Design an enzyme around this catalytic site. Sequence first.
Site, PDB file in Angstrom:
ATOM      1  N   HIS C  90      26.870  39.914  39.728  1.00 48.27           N
ATOM      2  CA  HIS C  90      26.069  40.821  40.523  1.00 48.27           C
ATOM      3  C   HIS C  90      25.095  41.616  39.649  1.00 48.27           C
ATOM      4  O   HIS C  90      23.903  41.676  39.937  1.00 48.27           O
ATOM      5  CB  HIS C  90      27.016  41.726  41.308  1.00 48.27           C
ATOM      6  CG  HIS C  90      26.333  42.626  42.285  1.00 48.27           C
ATOM      7  ND1 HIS C  90      26.331  42.476  43.643  1.00 48.27           N
ATOM      8  CD2 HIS C  90      25.528  43.681  41.995  1.00 48.27           C
ATOM      9  CE1 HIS C  90      25.559  43.427  44.160  1.00 48.27           C
ATOM     10  NE2 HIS C  90      25.040  44.198  43.193  1.00 48.27           N
ATOM     11  N   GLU C  91      25.562  42.212  38.560  1.00 50.78           N
ATOM     12  CA  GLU C  91      24.681  42.995  37.694  1.00 50.78           C
ATOM     13  C   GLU C  91      23.678  42.150  36.924  1.00 50.78           C
ATOM     14  O   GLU C  91      22.545  42.568  36.730  1.00 50.78           O
ATOM     15  CB  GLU C  91      25.482  43.812  36.692  1.00 50.78           C
ATOM     16  CG  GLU C  91      26.483  44.794  37.298  1.00 50.78           C
ATOM     17  CD  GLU C  91      25.937  45.530  38.516  1.00 50.78           C
ATOM     18  OE1 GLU C  91      24.867  46.152  38.400  1.00 50.78           O
ATOM     19  OE2 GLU C  91      26.564  45.485  39.594  1.00 50.78           O
ATOM     20  N   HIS C  94      20.865  41.400  39.244  1.00 49.04           N
ATOM     21  CA  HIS C  94      19.917  42.497  39.243  1.00 49.04           C
ATOM     22  C   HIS C  94      18.942  42.372  38.092  1.00 49.04           C
ATOM     23  O   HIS C  94      17.743  42.311  38.331  1.00 49.04           O
ATOM     24  CB  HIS C  94      20.624  43.840  39.210  1.00 49.04           C
ATOM     25  CG  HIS C  94      21.129  44.282  40.538  1.00 49.04           C
ATOM     26  ND1 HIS C  94      20.413  44.332  41.698  1.00 49.04           N
ATOM     27  CD2 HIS C  94      22.383  44.727  40.814  1.00 49.04           C
ATOM     28  CE1 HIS C  94      21.194  44.833  42.655  1.00 49.04           C
ATOM     29  NE2 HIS C  94      22.414  45.082  42.160  1.00 49.04           N
ATOM     30  N   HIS C 100      19.762  44.280  46.309  1.00 46.86           N
ATOM     31  CA  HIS C 100      20.850  44.062  47.248  1.00 46.86           C
ATOM     32  C   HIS C 100      20.365  43.440  48.550  1.00 46.86           C
ATOM     33  O   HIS C 100      19.257  43.700  49.002  1.00 46.86           O
ATOM     34  CB  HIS C 100      21.584  45.357  47.530  1.00 46.86           C
ATOM     35  CG  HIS C 100      22.191  45.977  46.312  1.00 46.86           C
ATOM     36  ND1 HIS C 100      21.782  47.115  45.675  1.00 46.86           N
ATOM     37  CD2 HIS C 100      23.293  45.532  45.663  1.00 46.86           C
ATOM     38  CE1 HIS C 100      22.630  47.364  44.671  1.00 46.86           C
ATOM     39  NE2 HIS C 100      23.562  46.406  44.611  1.00 46.86           N
ATOM     40  N   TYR C 149      26.276  44.235  50.218  1.00 45.62           N
ATOM     41  CA  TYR C 149      27.307  45.303  50.104  1.00 45.62           C
ATOM     42  C   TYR C 149      28.523  44.970  50.973  1.00 45.62           C
ATOM     43  O   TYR C 149      28.339  44.372  52.051  1.00 45.62           O
ATOM     44  CB  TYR C 149      26.741  46.653  50.551  1.00 45.62           C
ATOM     45  CG  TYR C 149      26.168  47.508  49.450  1.00 45.62           C
ATOM     46  CD1 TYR C 149      26.071  47.038  48.152  1.00 45.62           C
ATOM     47  CD2 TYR C 149      25.720  48.793  49.708  1.00 45.62           C
ATOM     48  CE1 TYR C 149      25.545  47.823  47.139  1.00 45.62           C
ATOM     49  CE2 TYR C 149      25.188  49.589  48.708  1.00 45.62           C
ATOM     50  CZ  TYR C 149      25.100  49.102  47.417  1.00 45.62           C
ATOM     51  OH  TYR C 149      24.579  49.881  46.426  1.00 45.62           O
TER      52      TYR C 149
HETATM   53 ZN    ZN Z   1      23.862  45.573  43.079  1.00 41.85          ZN
END
Ligand code: ZN
Lengths: 242, 535, 529, 282
Positions: C90-91, C94, C100, C149
């Site tokens: 996930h990071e 980014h 997101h 999320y």
């Molecule tokens: Zn995120």
Amino acid sequence: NGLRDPNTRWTFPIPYILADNLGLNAKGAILYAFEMFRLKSCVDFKPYEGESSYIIFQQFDGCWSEVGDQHVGQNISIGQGCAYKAIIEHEILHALGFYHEQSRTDRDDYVNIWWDQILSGYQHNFDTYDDSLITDLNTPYDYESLMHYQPFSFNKNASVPTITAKIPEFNSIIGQRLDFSAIDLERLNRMYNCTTTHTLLDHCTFEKANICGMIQGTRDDTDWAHQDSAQAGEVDHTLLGQ
Amino acid sequence: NGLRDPNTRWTFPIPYILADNLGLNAKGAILYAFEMFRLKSCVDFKPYEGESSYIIFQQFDGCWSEVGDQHVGQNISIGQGCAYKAIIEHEILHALGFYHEQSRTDRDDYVNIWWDQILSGYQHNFDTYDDSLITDLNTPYDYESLMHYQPFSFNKNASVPTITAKIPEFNSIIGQRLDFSAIDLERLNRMYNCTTTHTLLDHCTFEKANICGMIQGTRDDTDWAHQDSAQAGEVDHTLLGQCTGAGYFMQFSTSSGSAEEAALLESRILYPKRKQQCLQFFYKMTGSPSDRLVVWVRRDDSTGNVRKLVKVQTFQGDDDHNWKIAHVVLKEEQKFRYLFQGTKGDPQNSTGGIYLDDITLTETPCPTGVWTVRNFSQVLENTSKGDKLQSPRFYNSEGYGFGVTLYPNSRESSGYLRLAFHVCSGENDAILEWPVENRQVIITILDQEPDVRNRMSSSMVFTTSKSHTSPAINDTVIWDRPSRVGTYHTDCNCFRSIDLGWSGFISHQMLKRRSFLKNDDLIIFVDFEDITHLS
Amino acid sequence: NGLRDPNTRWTFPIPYILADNLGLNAKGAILYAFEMFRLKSCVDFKPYEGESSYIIFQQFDGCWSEVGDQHVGQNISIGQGCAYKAIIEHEILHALGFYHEQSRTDRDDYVNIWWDQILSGYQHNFDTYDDSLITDLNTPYDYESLMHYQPFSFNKNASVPTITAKIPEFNSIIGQRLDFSAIDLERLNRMYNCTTTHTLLDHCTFEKANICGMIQGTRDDTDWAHQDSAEVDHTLLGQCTGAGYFMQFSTSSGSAEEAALLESRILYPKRKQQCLQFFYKMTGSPSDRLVVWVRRDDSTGNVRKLVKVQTFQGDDDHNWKIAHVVLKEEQKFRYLFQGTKGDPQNSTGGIYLDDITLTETPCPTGVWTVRNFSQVLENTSKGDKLQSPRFYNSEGYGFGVTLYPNSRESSGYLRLAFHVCSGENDAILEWPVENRQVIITILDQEPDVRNRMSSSMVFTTSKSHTSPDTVIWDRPSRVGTYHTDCNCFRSIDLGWSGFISHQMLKRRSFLKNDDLIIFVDFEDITHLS
Amino acid sequence: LLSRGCNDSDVLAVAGFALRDINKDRKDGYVLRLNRVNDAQEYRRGGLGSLFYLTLDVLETDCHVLRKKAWQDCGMRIFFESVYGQCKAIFYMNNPSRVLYLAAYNCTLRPVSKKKIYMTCPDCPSSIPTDSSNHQVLEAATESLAKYNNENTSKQYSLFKVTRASSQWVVGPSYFVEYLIKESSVPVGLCKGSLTRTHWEKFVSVTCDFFGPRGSVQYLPDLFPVHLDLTTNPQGETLDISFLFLEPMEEKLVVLPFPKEKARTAECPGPAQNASPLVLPP
Ligand SMILES: [Zn+2]
Ligand SMILES: *[C@@H]1O[C@H](CO[C@@H]2O[C@@H](C)[C@@H](O)[C@@H](O)[C@@H]2O)[C@@H](O[C@@H]2O[C@H](CO)[C@@H](O[C@@H]3O[C@H](CO)[C@@H](O)[C@H](O)[C@@H]3O)[C@H](O)[C@H]2NC(C)=O)[C@H](O)[C@H]1NC(C)=O
Ligand SMILES: *[C@@H]1O[C@H](CO[C@@H]2O[C@@H](C)[C@@H](O)[C@@H](O)[C@@H]2O)[C@@H](O[C@@H]2O[C@H](CO)[C@@H](O[C@@H]3O[C@H](CO)[C@@H](O)[C@H](O)[C@@H]3O)[C@H](O)[C@H]2NC(C)=O)[C@H](O)[C@H]1NC(C)=O
Ligand SMILES: *[C@@H]1O[C@H](CO)[C@@H](O[C@@H]2O[C@H](CO)[C@@H](O[C@@H]3O[C@H](CO)[C@@H](O)[C@H](O)[C@H]3NC(C)=O)[C@H](O)[C@H]2NC(C)=O)[C@H](O)[C@H]1NC(C)=O
Ligand SMILES: *[C@@H]1O[C@H](CO)[C@@H](O[C@@H]2O[C@H](CO)[C@@H](O[C@@H]3O[C@H](CO)[C@@H](O)[C@H](O)[C@H]3NC(C)=O)[C@H](O)[C@H]2NC(C)=O)[C@H](O)[C@H]1NC(C)=O
Ligand SMILES: *[C@@H]1O[C@H](CO)[C@@H](O[C@@H]2O[C@H](CO)[C@@H](O)[C@H](O)[C@H]2NC(C)=O)[C@H](O)[C@H]1NC(C)=O
Ligand SMILES: *[C@@H]1O[C@H](CO)[C@@H](O[C@@H]2O[C@H](CO)[C@@H](O)[C@H](O)[C@H]2NC(C)=O)[C@H](O)[C@H]1NC(C)=O
Ligand SMILES: *[C@@H]1O[C@H](CO)[C@@H](O[C@@H]2O[C@H](CO)[C@@H](O)[C@H](O)[C@H]2NC(C)=O)[C@H](O)[C@H]1NC(C)=O
Ligand SMILES: *[C@@H]1O[C@H](CO)[C@@H](O[C@@H]2O[C@H](CO)[C@@H](O)[C@H](O)[C@H]2NC(C)=O)[C@H](O)[C@H]1NC(C)=O
Ligand SMILES: *[C@@H]1O[C@H](CO)[C@@H](O[C@@H]2O[C@H](CO)[C@@H](O)[C@H](O)[C@H]2NC(C)=O)[C@H](O)[C@H]1NC(C)=O
Ligand SMILES: *[C@@H]1O[C@H](CO)[C@@H](O)[C@H](O)[C@H]1NC(C)=O
Ligand SMILES: *[C@@H]1O[C@H](CO)[C@@H](O)[C@H](O)[C@H]1NC(C)=O
Ligand SMILES: [Ca+2]
Ligand SMILES: [Ca+2]
Ligand SMILES: [Ca+2]
Ligand SMILES: [Ca+2]
Ligand SMILES: [Ca+2]
Ligand SMILES: [Zn+2]
């Protein structure tokens, strides 16, 4: 324990100065150590004739050498009592790019250092060098090495050893001051590509049936037996019937 | 016998070319001979890449070399029948500035030349050279030299020698073609300033209380004893009780304590030069059958720390209590230590231990198959002419099954040992290519000396070839699927090919000399590998 | 959700720094996350060597990244509990340039945000960006996106979801932490012009009639059938009529020792080591042998040098079985399957082959298949358990896993927990074993790795793992509990209450043949210190 | 404030003169050689000269300060016992009036790095603190003094203080020392000597040579911070200098706070007399 960088290697004969501050006993002990080098390796020495690097031996404070060929030429010191042949040999092995045997990268596999028993201000004399600085010359750690420190070296208390062999037998051996060890020669020869000693002209023990390339004359009447050491009292000198 | 002029020296590696007029067998044998140079000396060889002096190897008339580096580059001939390693080593020693041993200046002191027995016009092949042309390298005349001519060299009469030793025992030894002599290596090293060798990475015989810089673990349970051969019936493998007070082996007793107690004999840190090594050693497992000798490799984790552990092989106690040979293929490209975990299984059922001696670590392939015959001298006496022994089937990298037939007393010549390769049927045959077309066969009788430089092993080489056929199989290739061509043996539940190899691989007197029967036993290595990639 | 500005696109490999404030577990888990990128995308990572922009991974407060390449280089934070594969992925997504998923411009069409349930001072964490800042890459909104999320994200009242899908079924699916979704990989591919992965070297389910370019031997007696599931395959289990395909070598007829080679295409390994995964059956004789071979380059550019790599035999279990063979190829090669008949008179069956996958990665150190796993869940009380056979790591540490198929700790969860087993080597190994990263992975069982979204939890054996009060990872003979079940002293078990929920395990082919496959690695990461 | 080069011909002379003044001011220890100027900065005041602020790199020479030599009168010490480090000094100059003056200084010194010595020469006698906790160094200096008293019948001498010490262990415990003496006063000369024990033979050796401003020196443990200010005032301090002049006319000097090393030029530090990385300061 040899300095890896090949630039640090001498090119023989190592030219030497003996400084006149040396006693006669120290000058003669140096030349006697050179005879041992010439006798056990291809290491050779010559008097100085203006070369770029050379050893000057000195009676300075203590008994010490820079390690390997400093290309400007370098001091070695031989203070009182370092007139002993083996201590000259040890300092000349430093001059020939060798660190102490307990300063090998793997030394902790072979010797305990009792840091608590070292004099405060002297623990660094038990530093060990990484393998980028030093080769093993594909040799084992040698307790019999002339480059090794004895058990009572830099100790607080005269009765308590600073350094001890993990194989406990060798406590009675480490830091011998007899001569080069067989592995010190094996290392020295690997370091300098020495295959022939300057002064060992021949040796023979007859262990091989070609009798070391001796021959028997025919002008004489008879021949010497090459004798098998097998008879009841008649043993060889090499092996004594062992 | 060395060419004195230092301008005639090579600078290693020697750049070389293998011409395509060499048969595949000859190309393969030349590379095998280089591996012996790389293993016994600092001599090395590289493929040619535009150098001014180089060796080209070619199949011309006969088998010969110019002497020393010719700075324009030079021919070695290896003519048909000269494929055996010792002949290649002899020719490469000529290119490395050596003359024949009987051409030494002093040779008349050591050999008789029976001039009248030499064929006419061949007297010159026995010309000596003066000390201006050649150095002795401060070495004696060596009868055991590879350069020395055989007694029957250029002779008129096949019953009568040309050349004989003035020490008459060496009549039987002059012109050995096993290997380099110890003095030939000494001279080669004195010529080329060698001390190390590229492919012997370690060895140990334990004769020194230093134990070759091996160390004992402390995260293990106990220690291997550095056991003295003085105890009755309990000798080392290096000396086998020959020297009193001086044979040594590591011994891990398994007779007492708990099961699964262990001791990790640990070697000094090693810095491999190649991607593969073969750890050879001699061992015994007289203790419980549940005892394990495990070989382990501690290797660098790339942080300069040799702490990572890799199990590589296990050995276990068969009913054979005598000194066994082992080989372990290691694959270390980073600094590593070879290790021996001794492990106790059932001390309630052990009356003995695990033992080690004669360790040797070479940066080579291992022998693909290894066969040991116990009590060989007694076998050799008891066996009639033409009787046979057969090696257990072994599988090569490619999975071809194979074995060696040993005929201890050759029916083809008295006092010779006949040793012949065959392909065995095996589990893989149904997917392998047939007939075997380019798989080189190297058979070696190991000289059991731990230091490879000391060893003078005997070795013969051939490549399985389309030309190898017999009427016994309707003139088809011998190397075709053994079920179709070979003969059945309930002795292993195998077919085995017709067997090819040498009547008189070695003589009985030659085998007895050099301590080939070190324990009175005989150890044969076999390799069998594809050389097609040399075509 | 991709950052539109093309100046923000990294050029691969992304140079990285693992800052020493990272725990060993985080360092190892980040190197494991990089492997998933190299295995599922054209993204690549390298150690830092003075490059202008780079990612420095650091243990700061929680998990975060600046989005896209900052041309001066940038932080990624991986704080406490942040060191899991999907959280790191996930990071890194980014930093690669993704926002997101609920920040999509069109998000309102797909999700509700319950503003009144968001914590006060967190409202901007649910901001949506215009199509000037972002790009859909012409892809639908993805509820399954790793960039989405979870429903209870930033809520006031822990009982109540902040974010819900308008299609209400997806609410359970949203905020998955298994790994990258198909859409996420597809968006990543479009953003970085990815066309293929770096470490997916081959895969083959045989669904195509050309059998993935595989070829049959002529220097053999017989051929594998390309069999039609008319007895079914593993890719479809007979779900689709006429499309189930698997190689079959019958051993019920002919002589024994009769064989067939099936050989791959010629393959060009980019790394020194590969793992040949496949699924197989050996319904035939016990003496039948499935032998994996390599036909590697003989060093003259001709792929002909055989090397036998592994043999598989037939157990009473005749269900599809998962195989792995470590290959160590550094030159072009074919992997091969020799099917061999042993005792046809005592075979009623044959050897089978489907869903082959070849990756340029280590093979799973241990692999456990729990059969009829739906039946196990129906049979098994909360706090009843199953235990793997005793694997051994590369260093020789004996180890296994405990599975509690119904968690006692909550309804509808597995607990998976690693333990160190006593083994034949222990007497020479260091104790406690620590700095050894455990990776437990529930295999997703797609034959294509990009399709797979395997669930994986990672931890590092540590001195801090002490059970009242010696380290759990100390020697099993003296801190483990004995098991007559394998004659093993299995140690105290550590892992995750709720490794995965049952309702997630029902989906994604985790139980593809109604059976659960768990991989384990247990590998030393001390060299990352 | 004007930052100045360390190779500038005025700065080089000023640093030498300032270091000579520091050696003369010192009541104990050794004459320091200027290895190089390390930073230099100047406050300018028109016709009545300038105030210089100097940072130095320096080495300990073979002469004790009670010998009162200039550092050009003294040799380079041996590498295995070199003391090295840095000085900050404040110095007024006015060549037209022939007025030159060391206002104030501080210096930080160290023995050469013990690791870097060991690596260069493993057997070299490693240098150590001279304080009374080292009984065996005191035994060495008192044995060499006893030998000197036995050799010299005309006069007898007593130990004042031990000024330098080192030891080595190869042939056995081997101590080497320098120390001060007086007859049986201001200390009358510097002694040099040794004590060595083997297990059996023993050796002793000796040779001996017979011979305000605000500031300080410190000798620190081995691997150079230097605290110095006559004022904190950003305006500077109007310090009296009238007494410097041949007629002591009313003159006062504005001493600004010591100019910080963040204002170094690319012409600093200068060329070294001994550039060896063992003893050249950071
Ligand atoms: Zn995120
Ligand atoms: C205990 O261990 C022995 C062998 O070990 C030896 O004897 C112990 C008492 C200790 O002195 C050890 O230090 C020593 O090494 C076991 O005996 C062996 O058992 C095996 C298995 O039954 C036998 O192997 C078979 O042999 C036949 C031919 O004879 C073959 O056809 C078979 O294929 C198979 O190889 C082996 O012959 C036997 N050897 C001897 C000398 O008896 C013994 O079983 C074991 N006992 C227990 C209770 O553990
Ligand atoms: C013939 O082969 C069967 C097994 O193979 C299966 O049956 C054939 C007739 C064909 O239909 C094949 O296609 C099919 O795969 C052999 O039977 C198996 O033998 C083994 C060894 O004895 C048994 O294993 C043991 O089982 C017990 C429990 O029963 C365990 O405690 C043991 O640890 C061990 O695992 C196995 O159970 C058995 N299986 C079956 C289904 O009977 C059979 O031996 C063989 N016969 C011959 C003459 O070759
Ligand atoms: C003892 O024998 C050694 C060989 O066993 C000699 O080692 C060789 O020394 C050469 C220089 O004399 C080296 O050449 C250099 O190689 C490097 C790459 O490794 C190049 O960058 C250099 O340019 C090149 N120098 C020149 C002038 O071409 C050999 O690489 C080196 N070989 C090995 C295996 O180390 C020793 O020199 C020799 N020592 C003594 C004291 O006799
Ligand atoms: C094995 O080691 C020998 C030393 O033990 C090497 O021998 C030395 O080689 C030097 C050249 O590398 C020779 O120097 C040259 O000598 C000739 C006269 O012989 C002079 O004309 C040259 O000017 C001089 N070279 C230069 C650059 O000035 C040494 O003379 C020679 N020493 C001895 C005692 O022989 C061997 O070269 C070496 N051989 C191999 C194969 O490694
Ligand atoms: C040197 O080491 C020895 C051994 O550790 C010390 O000897 C012991 O001293 C105590 C008193 O402190 C006696 O009660 C013991 O009987 C002594 N043991 C032996 C073996 O004699 C010794 O005190 C140490 N000396 C110094 C100066 O450190
Ligand atoms: C080759 O050498 C052998 C051995 O010396 C010769 O053999 C002799 O032959 C004669 C008959 O021709 C016999 O009377 C002798 O008894 C043989 N001697 C021995 C020792 O057996 C042989 O004749 C020689 N042949 C040639 C062609 O030179
Ligand atoms: C990574 O983040 C840290 C803050 O956690 C940054 O460190 C700060 O950098 C500024 C600017 O140089 C300094 O003024 C701060 O004092 C630093 N703080 C700390 C805690 O070190 C760091 O620069 C960032 N690095 C990158 C490449 O983004
Ligand atoms: C969190 O949300 C739940 C569900 O909306 C709230 O639960 C209700 O609480 C009241 C008392 O305040 C009870 O009378 C109801 O029966 C509960 N409903 C359910 C479905 O359990 C809860 O109050 C909220 N808590 C907070 C802290 O906001
Ligand atoms: C050996 O060490 C001495 C120092 O003990 C060096 O001699 C010094 O050399 C410098 C430069 O000429 C002089 O300033 C000193 O006055 C000298 N001191 C003494 C006591 O002579 C000498 O140069 C070194 N020699 C070698 C070859 O290393
Ligand atoms: C070897 O000979 C000895 C007798 O010396 C005998 O005891 C032993 O059993 C023989 N071993 C073999 C394997 O023949
Ligand atoms: C799995 O389920 C089938 C019924 O579909 C049953 O026949 C079989 O015995 C079960 N096997 C296992 C291993 O539970
Ligand atoms: Ca005679
Ligand atoms: Ca031990
Ligand atoms: Ca031995
Ligand atoms: Ca399929
Ligand atoms: Ca086929
Ligand atoms: Zn020394």
